[PDB]
Amino acid sequence: TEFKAGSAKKGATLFKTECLQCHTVEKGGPHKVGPNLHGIFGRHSGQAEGYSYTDANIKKNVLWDENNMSEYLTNPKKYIPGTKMAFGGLKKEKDRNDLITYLKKATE
């Protein structure tokens, strides 16, 4: 995948509709169905403190960046078979770029 910097404004809306159900982004924010996402970029997968992950999410051991995040969010179970993230994916390229542009800011 080839991430291109988009609109964090549009991305914030996408996060609210597609992700917020299962995730928070703020430092010190709570785990929900899914892990809090603060500090995700530049950290290996399956490491949010206090959250119990699948073996698949831990053993993937991917250093998250904008490009591999874009592949993951296209089709989560295809990138990490055995995941328990029940999200089908964002099939539209502009949606992935906008979402990731937001996530880079919101998880810092």
Ligand X SMILES: O=S(=O)(O)c1cc2c(O)c(c1)Cc1cc(S(=O)(=O)O)cc(c1O)Cc1cc(S(=O)(=O)O)cc(c1O)Cc1cc(S(=O)(=O)O)cc(c1O)C2
Both structure tokens of 106: 């919101």
Rounded-to-integer distance, Cα 9 and Cα 1, Å: 22
CA geometry: angle 82, 102, 100, nearest 5 deg? 40
The DSSP line for 3-54 is -----HHHHHHHHHHHTTTT---STTPPP-SS---TT-TTSBSS--TT----
> Which residues, numbered 67-96, are part of the site for ligand X (CB under 6 A)?
92-95
Residue among 34, 66, 97, 102 that touches ligand HEC (CB under 6 A): 34
Of the two residues 57 and 101, which places its CB atom closer to ligand X in the complex? 101
The yes or no reply on residue 10 touching ligand X (CB under 6 A) is yes
Among 8, 18, 71, 75, binds ligand HEC (CB under 6 A): 18
- Does position 105 interact with ligand X (CB under 6 A)? The reply is no
The answer to whether 80 touches 72, Cβ cutoff 8 Å, is yes
The residues binding ligand X (CB under 6 A) are: 4, 6-7, 10, 92-95, 97
The residues binding ligand HEC (CB under 6 A) are: 18-19, 21-23, 33-35, 40, 45-48, 53-54, 56-57, 73, 83-87, 90, 99, 103
